[PDB]
Write a protein that binds this ligand. Structure first.
Ligand SMILES: C[C@H](Cc1nc(NCc2ccco2)nc2ccc(Cl)cc12)C(=O)NO
Ligand SMILES: C[C@H](Cc1nc(NCc2ccco2)nc2ccc(Cl)cc12)C(=O)NO
Ligand SMILES: [Zn+2]
Ligand SMILES: [Zn+2]
Length: 339
C-alpha cells in the first residue's frame, strides 16, 4: 500500500512509489533519483510512464533495463506539461540526476517535492524564487540539530590532501574508495586528479558511471585496475580483511592501502581537519563525512526562506517520537521567521 506522502493530491502523480504494484489512479510515476530506496520495484516489466531526469533515465534504461517507451526524461529548469499539469524539475544537489519537482496544480496550489536533497542557497535563485509554495514534501533525513557535518568542499580538501601526502611519501601506496550507489563521485575523482591517475573499477561500476553525463569521463575512469593507483571497491570490502585480500590482487605492486569510506553523519566531537584513520599494519581506513543530504542548518535555512504553508516530511516518519520532534522544529522555524 502506497503511503500518503508519496501521492500528489489533486493529481494522478506519485513520487518514488514503485514497490506498491499498480497504484490506483496513478497516471504518471515520478522518480526523483536513482537510489535503491526510491526506485525499488522498477524493472524491465514495468509498463507505466516514468518521469525523471535524463541521467536517471539513462540508468533506468541501462541498469534496470526499463523499456525506452516508458522512460520520459525531462530537462531541468524547464516548464513542462505532464498529463495536463505544469511541472518543473530542479537540481537537488544530491547524487547525479537527482531532482526536486515543482507541481503547479490546476487549482493554483504549488507543491515542491525535494526528493532527496542537500539544501543550498544557490537554490534560492532557481524557478523557486518568489514562487509561493503551499506544500513542501521535505527530505528530513537529518532534521535534528546534532546533525552537523562540513561542506563537501572541506571534506574533499581533506581527502585530496591526505591522499596526496600519503602517495608522495610512499609512491607505492594504493588508494581505495568504497562505493555502492551513485553519488559522492567527487571523492574518488578529486583524489585521482591530484594523483595524476585514472580510477580503476569493475565493469559494473564503469557501466554505471558511463550513464551520468560526467564531462570527459573517458579520460578519468578505467576498468584496467593495475594501471590505476585509485581503485573503487564495494563498500562492504572496505575493511581490514577485504583490503588485505585486495592487496594480493595487484601482484605485489603496492605495499600500502589508504582507504576512504564516505559515510553520512556519524556521532564523531571532532573537526574535519582532525579526522584520524583506523590502522592495521599497512592498511588505513578513513571515514569521511561526505553528505549528499542537508545538514540541520542547511535544511532550516532553506525552509525558512521558502516559507511553505505546510510541510510533509518524507524521512524519519515511522515513529511518534520522530514525527513529533520534526513538527516541533517546523513550528520553531515558522515562529522565528514569521510565516
Ligand atoms: C547498503 C544497503 C542499503 C541501505 N539500507 C539501509 N537500511 C535499510 C535496509 C537494510 C537492509 C535492507 O534494507 N540504510 C542505508 C543507509 C545508507 C546507505 Cl548508503 C544504504 C543503506 C544496506 O546497508 N543494507 O541493505
Ligand atoms: C545513498 C543513499 C542510500 C540510502 N540512504 C539512506 N539514508 C541516508 C544515508 C545514511 C548514510 C548515507 O545516506 N537510507 C537508505 C535506506 C535504504 C536504502 Cl536501500 C538506501 C538508503 C541515498 O541517498 N538513498 O536515497
Ligand atoms: Zn538518495
Ligand atoms: Zn533516499
Amino acid at each position: 500500500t502506497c503511503p500518503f506522502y508519496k501521492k500528489i493530491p489533486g493529481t494522478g502523480f506519485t513520487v518514488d512509489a514503485f514497490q506498491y504494484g499498480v497504484v490506483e489512479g496513478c497516471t504518471a510515476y515520478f522518480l526523483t533519483h536513482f537510489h535503491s530506496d526510491h526506485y525499488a520495484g522498477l524493472s524491465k516489466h514495468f509498463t507505466f510512464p516514468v518521469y525523471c531526469s535524463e541521467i536517471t533515465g539513462n540508468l533506468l534504461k541501462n541498469k534496470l533495463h526499463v523499456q525506452e517507451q516508458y522512460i520520459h526524461p525531462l530537462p531541468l529548469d524547464t516548464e513542462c506539461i505532464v498529463n495536463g499539469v505544469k511541472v518543473v524539475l530542479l537540481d537537488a544537489n544530491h547524487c547525479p540526476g537527482a531532482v526536486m519537482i515543482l507541481f503547479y496544480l490546476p487549482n493554483g496550489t504549488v507543491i515542491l517535492h525535494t526528493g532527496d536533497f542537500r539544501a543550498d542557497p544557490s537554490m534560492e535563485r532557481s524557478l523557486l524564487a518568489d514562487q509561493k509554495v503551499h506544500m513542501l514534501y521535505l527530505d528530513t533525513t537529518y532534521c535534528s540539530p546534532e546533525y552537523t557535518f562540513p561542506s563537501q568542499q572541506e571534506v574533499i580538501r581533506f581527502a585530496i590532501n591526505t591522499a596526496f601526502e600519503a602517495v608522495t611519501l610512499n609512491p607505492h601506496a594504493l588508494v581505495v574508495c568504497g562505493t555502492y550507489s551513485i553519488g559522492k563521485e567527487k571523492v574518488f575523482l578529486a583524489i585521482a586528479d591530484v594523483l595524476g591517475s585514472k580510477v580503476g573499477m569493475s565493469q559494473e561500476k564503469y557501466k554505471t558511471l558511463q550513464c551520468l553525463n560526467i564531462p570527459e569521463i573517458n579520460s578519468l575512469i578505467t576498468t584496467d585496475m593495475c594501471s590505476s593507483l585509485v581503485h573503487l571497491l564495494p563498500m562492504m570490502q572496505i575493511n581490514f580483511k577485504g583490503l588485505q585480500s585486495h592487496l594480493k590482487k595487484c601482484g605485489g605492486k603496492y605495499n600500502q592501502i589508504l582507504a576512504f569510506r564516505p559515510t553520512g553523519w556519524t556521532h564523531s566531537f571532532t573537526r574535519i581537519a582532525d579526522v584520524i584513520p583506523q590502522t592495521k599494519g599497512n592498511i588505513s581506513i578513513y571515514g569521511i563525512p561526505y553528505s549528499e543530504h542537508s545538514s540541520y542548518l542547511e535544511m532550516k535555512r532553506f525552509v525558512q526562506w521558502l516559507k511553505p504553508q505546510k510541510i510533509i516530511p518524507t524521512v524519519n516518519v515511522g515513529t511518534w517520537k520522530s514525527r513529533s520532534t520534526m513538527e516541533k522544529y517546523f513550528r520553531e522555524w515558522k515562529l522565528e521567521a514569521g510565516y
